[PDB]
Design an enzyme around this catalytic site. Structure first.
Site, short mmCIF file in Angstrom:
data_model
loop_
_atom_site.label_atom_id
_atom_site.label_comp_id
_atom_site.label_asym_id
_atom_site.label_seq_id
_atom_site.Cartn_x
_atom_site.Cartn_y
_atom_site.Cartn_z
CG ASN A 70 9.66 0.34 -9.80
OD1 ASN A 70 8.86 0.23 -8.88
ND2 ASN A 70 9.93 1.53 -10.38
CE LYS B 242 11.61 2.86 -6.71
NZ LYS B 242 11.00 4.20 -6.45
CG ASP C 111 10.95 4.84 -11.20
OD1 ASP C 111 11.89 5.38 -10.56
OD2 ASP C 111 9.82 4.60 -10.68
CE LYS D 272 -2.48 0.02 3.71
NZ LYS D 272 -1.34 0.29 4.68
N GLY D 273 0.47 2.26 -0.75
CA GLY D 273 1.18 3.53 -0.78
C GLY D 273 0.21 4.68 -0.93
CB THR D 274 0.81 8.27 -1.78
OG1 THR D 274 2.10 8.21 -1.16
CG2 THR D 274 0.12 9.60 -1.44
CG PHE D 275 -0.47 7.53 -6.08
CD1 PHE D 275 0.87 7.62 -5.73
CD2 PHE D 275 -1.11 8.66 -6.61
CE1 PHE D 275 1.58 8.80 -5.90
CE2 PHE D 275 -0.41 9.85 -6.79
CZ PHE D 275 0.94 9.92 -6.43
N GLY D 276 -2.62 4.09 -3.60
CA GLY D 276 -3.51 2.96 -3.46
C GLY D 276 -2.82 1.72 -2.94
CE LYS D 277 -7.43 -0.88 -0.90
NZ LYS D 277 -8.37 -1.48 0.10
C1 SMR Z 1 0.60 6.24 -11.02
C2 SMR Z 1 1.21 6.30 -9.59
O1 SMR Z 1 0.89 5.10 -8.87
C3 SMR Z 1 1.99 4.21 -8.63
C4 SMR Z 1 2.64 4.49 -7.25
N1 SMR Z 1 2.72 3.31 -6.33
C5 SMR Z 1 3.88 2.44 -6.75
C6 SMR Z 1 3.71 0.89 -6.67
O2 SMR Z 1 3.05 0.33 -7.82
C7 SMR Z 1 5.10 0.21 -6.57
N2 SMR Z 1 5.05 -1.25 -6.87
C8 SMR Z 1 6.43 -1.82 -7.08
C9 SMR Z 1 6.46 -3.34 -7.43
C10 SMR Z 1 5.58 -4.13 -6.42
C11 SMR Z 1 4.15 -3.52 -6.25
C12 SMR Z 1 3.33 -4.35 -5.22
C13 SMR Z 1 3.30 -5.84 -5.68
C14 SMR Z 1 3.11 -5.97 -7.21
C15 SMR Z 1 3.18 -4.83 -8.06
C16 SMR Z 1 3.00 -4.94 -9.47
C17 SMR Z 1 2.74 -6.19 -10.09
C18 SMR Z 1 2.68 -7.31 -9.21
N3 SMR Z 1 2.46 -8.63 -9.51
N4 SMR Z 1 2.49 -9.35 -8.33
C19 SMR Z 1 2.72 -8.54 -7.29
C20 SMR Z 1 2.85 -7.22 -7.83
O3 SMR Z 1 3.44 -3.58 -7.51
C21 SMR Z 1 4.23 -2.02 -5.87
S1 SMR Z 1 2.33 3.56 -4.60
O4 SMR Z 1 3.50 4.25 -4.02
O5 SMR Z 1 1.05 4.26 -4.47
C22 SMR Z 1 2.17 1.84 -3.94
C23 SMR Z 1 3.14 1.26 -3.07
C24 SMR Z 1 4.37 2.01 -2.60
C25 SMR Z 1 2.96 -0.06 -2.61
C26 SMR Z 1 1.84 -0.81 -3.02
C27 SMR Z 1 0.87 -0.25 -3.88
C28 SMR Z 1 1.04 1.07 -4.34
C29 SMR Z 1 -0.02 1.64 -5.28
#
Ligand code: SMR
Lengths: 10, 318
Positions: free
Chosen positions: B136, B133, B131, B15-20
């Site tokens: 990601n 890192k 991006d 979960k982060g600022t923009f959702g989950k």
């Molecule tokens: C357009 C801007 O929105 C994007 C900004 N956000 C960034 C996130 O997407 C970062 N990602 C980085 C990679 C892992 C996450 C969580 C697990 C996951 C995916 C993507 C595909 C996946 N397949 N299986 C698991 C999986 O995304 C969160 S977030 O910071 O709000 C946030 C965080 C930190 C953590 C969890 C959810 C969110 C939404």
């Protein structure tokens, strides 16, 4: 190690 | 095709600022996916709309073993949902928060897969990722890399074509980006260099909690090399972290072809990387489909609870 980082755009 | 009610909501992944992101199960197929659920009001408030639509297009248009696949996009009155393939291995960030350092062989394996993916993005899709890192980069159930989070991608970027947006992640920003210069696709190889450095050295090559001090290090300081590093690893890191993008490994017309030829990758048959015929160094150790041991307890222990985005909704075909 390092804390989680945060993506951004200006 | 689908709505919120075509899915069961099992475990919170993050979960982060923009959702989950929630581990979901598709009712009709029994298949598990990860659903990214973003708050429309937050996206609008933070001016993230074009990024979300960019992530959507890039996911739809790409087909590669090391890029996260998208199955469905849809929206509600207040939500945007991406239904992506589930990567049970979590983020590389999860693993490096626990191991501290990967072996050169293990780092080489992931590095080759990332190169494969970025080469495809640059060459086939004309996309620069921007991006790269640890957060990601995920591992699938077999231990292969999955790049996530395409919201910062630049589309329609050919060979030497340049870009202007100040964006990415501070710790990972390339010198030419911090210089306020127009920059090309070689920013991606800088990001690869920082990720490989982290994998093999167990820290970022440049770090300060203060961004101004951090940016100064990036622009001014030569990278340090731990005495455990072999010569070809040193050479690779040295070439990827060249501050001038014109001198960077991969910074010329041949782009990724220059990295692929580097002696650090001497063992590697690139066609086998793509065909996934190379044995992964780590296979996620899960006991079920819903084993989320590679996601933070902080998230997995939790219980689950204005505009139209045009042309967002999507369903995969083949
Ligand atoms: C357009 C801007 O929105 C994007 C900004 N956000 C960034 C996130 O997407 C970062 N990602 C980085 C990679 C892992 C996450 C969580 C697990 C996951 C995916 C993507 C595909 C996946 N397949 N299986 C698991 C999986 O995304 C969160 S977030 O910071 O709000 C946030 C965080 C930190 C953590 C969890 C959810 C969110 C939404």
């Amino acid at each position: 190690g390092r804390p989680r980082t945060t993506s951004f755009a200006e | 095709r689908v709505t919120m009610n075509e899915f069961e909501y099992l475990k919170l992944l993050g979960k982060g600022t923009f959702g989950k992101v929630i581990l979901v199960k598709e009712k009709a197929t029994g298949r598990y996916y990860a659903m990214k659920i973003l708050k429309k009001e937050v996206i609008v408030a933070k001016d993230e709309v074009a990024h979300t639509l960019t992530e959507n297009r890039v996911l739809q248009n790409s087909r590669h073993p090391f890029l996260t696949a998208l199955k469905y996009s849809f929206q509600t009155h207040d939500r945007l949902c991406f239904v992506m393939e589930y990567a049970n291995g979590g983020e590389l960030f999860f693993h490096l928060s626990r191991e501290r350092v990967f072996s050169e062989d293990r780092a080489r394996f992931y590095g080759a897969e990332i190169v494969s993916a970025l080469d495809y993005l640059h060459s086939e899709k004309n996309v620069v990722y921007r991006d790269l890192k640890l957060e990601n980069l995920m591992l699938d159930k077999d231990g292969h890399i999955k790049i996530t989070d395409f919201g910062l991608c630049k589309e329609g970027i050919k060979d030497g074509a340049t870009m202007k947006t100040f964006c990415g992640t501070p710790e990972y920003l390339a010198p030419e980006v911090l210089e306020d210069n127009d920059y090309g696709r070689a920013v991606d190889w800088w990001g690869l260099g920082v990720v490989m450095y982290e994998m093999m050295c167990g820290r970022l090559p440049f770090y300060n909690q203060d961004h101004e001090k951090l940016f100064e290090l990036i622009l001014m300081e030569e990278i340090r090399f731990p005495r455990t590093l072999g010569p070809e690893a040193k050479s690779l890191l040295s070439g990827l972290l060249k501050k001038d993008p014109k001198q960077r490994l991969g910074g010329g017309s041949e782009d990724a072809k220059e990295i692929m030829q580097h002696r650090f990758f001497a063992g590697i048959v690139w066609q086998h990387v793509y065909e996934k015929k190379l044995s992964p160094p780590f296979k996620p150790q899960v006991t079920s489909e819903t084993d989320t041991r590679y996601f933070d307890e902080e998230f997995t222990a939790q219980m689950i609870t204005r505009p139209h985005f045009p042309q967002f909704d999507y369903s995969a075909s083949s």
